[PDB]
Amino acid sequence: MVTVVYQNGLPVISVRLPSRRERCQFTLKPISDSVGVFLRQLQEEDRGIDRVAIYSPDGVRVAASTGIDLLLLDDFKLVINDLTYHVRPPKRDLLSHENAATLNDVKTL
């Protein structure tokens, strides 16, 4: 199964990759990473991947330029080679992401 879990305010997507026995996790920046960034990371991780794509639950291809914040507003399908994974991210506000991974009362100069 492909899962999405927020850790320190950022989405961590855990994926079974075809060449690998063990799961691998991908942490993404919702406000600046795109669908295409994530798909490129998958391909870089496993040379056994010949095809990767993301689709809406209704089966419509999602544009590579789409922000990860927008992707994670709802369910989606992740195709890796000949397997399609139904991904169910946890719901949170689109506004949620603007203070992600910030430590309260410590600012960097």
Author numbering: 74 to 182
Sentences from the paper on this structure:
The mitochondrial calcium uniporter (MCU) is responsible for mitochondrial calcium uptake and homeostasis. MCU consists of two conserved transmembrane helices (TMs) connected by a 9‐aa linker with a four‐residue “DIME” motif flanked by an N‐terminal domain (NTD) and C‐terminal domain located within the mitochondrial matrix 11, 12, 13. MCU is associated with many regulatory proteins such as mitochondrial calcium uptake‐1 and mitochondrial calcium uptake‐2 (MICU1 and MICU2), an MCU paralog (MCUb), and essential MCU regulator (EMRE), forming the mitochondrial calcium uniporter complex (uniplex) 3, 4, 5, 6, 7. MCU NTD appears to be essential for the regulation of mitochondrial Ca2+ uptake through interaction with regulator(s) and/or modulation of post‐translational modifications.
